[PDB]
């Protein structure tokens, strides 16, 4: 019952969010391949609505971080419909209060490295010109 029963929570991914994410994916994905390139992922992120709404001026940096995370997760390889889902689940909760010790450390290191890479690439782009 704990495993399966779901209710609208505050700091957790809910069933309504799951259904809305599936709807967005379906309106994004064409033939249910489950693998999409970076452009499809970023357009899906732009099209996310509801509780997972990402205002541009509010979380532009977060959106860029998520897009680069999707890029780096497979060295530019296409996601498997769960990498996006796993990323959304991770970014929609409190990592410190939820994950286990080793998993929390690994996730924090990975997110910090991704943020540093994004900042370095942004600086390189802004300084090359």
């Amino acid at each position: 019952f704990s495993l399966f029963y779901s209710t609208e929570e505050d700091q957790l991914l809910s069933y309504n969010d799951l259904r809305h994410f599936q709807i967005i994916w379906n309106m994004v994905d064409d033939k249910r391949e489950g693998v999409i390139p970076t452009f499809r992922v970023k357009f899906l992120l732009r099209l996310l609505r509801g509780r997972l709404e990402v205002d541009l001026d509010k979380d532009k940096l977060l959106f860029k971080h998520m897009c680069y995370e999707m890029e780096r997760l497979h060295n530019g390889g296409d996601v498997t419909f769960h990498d996006v889902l796993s990323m959304l689940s991770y970014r929609s909760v409190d990592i410190r209060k939820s994950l286990q010790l080793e998993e929390l450390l690994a996730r924090e290191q990975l997110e910090y490295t991704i943020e540093e890479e994004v900042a370095k690439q942004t600086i390189r782009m802004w300084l090359k010109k």
Partner: protein, 145 residues
């Protein structure tokens, strides 16, 4: 709880693990896109996806289930109205299933397990209907029940 390694964890950790396990089995929805300029099928697709239509189907199924309030017997002088009402409900369900199939997809409809179960139920219903039209026995009433 201790043997499965969750007693030492916090409640939030357990919730996160349960969410991860749940998302592991989540799968994309099975709705093909609605075609444009094909009003005959696009309108049907809109009809089948209307929440009021789903509530109507649920209410009809509930009424058909209620139709089994009394025991079905051949000696029963009032089983004929129940059989007729069940036949009408089965006809409605079969026509609705056919409408959903033609609107959604001849094969994509099969993607949903719920739709497969509904198709099986409607097939059993039409088989029972024709058997009632032919056999008309207590075994037929039991099959319909």
């Amino acid at each position: 709880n201790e043997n499965k390694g969750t007693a030492l964890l916090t409640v939030d950790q357990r919730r996160w693990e349960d969410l991860k396990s749940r998302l592991k089995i989540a799968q994309p929805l099975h709705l093909p896109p609605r075609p444009d300029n094909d009003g005959f099928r696009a309108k049907m697709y809109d009809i089948t996806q209307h929440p009021f239509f789903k509530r109507t189907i649920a209410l009809l199924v509930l009424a058909q289930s209620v139709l089994l309030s009394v025991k079905w017997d051949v000696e029963d002088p009032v089983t004929v109205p129940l059989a007729t009402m069940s036949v009408v409900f089965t006809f409605i369900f079969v026509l609705e299933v056919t409408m959903k199939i033609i609107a959604m997809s001849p094969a994509g409809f099969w993607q949903s397990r719920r739709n497969r179960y509904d198709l099986l139920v409607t097939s059993l219903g039409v088989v029972w209907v024709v058997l009632h039209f032919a056999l008309l026995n207590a075994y037929t009433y039991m099959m319909g029940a």
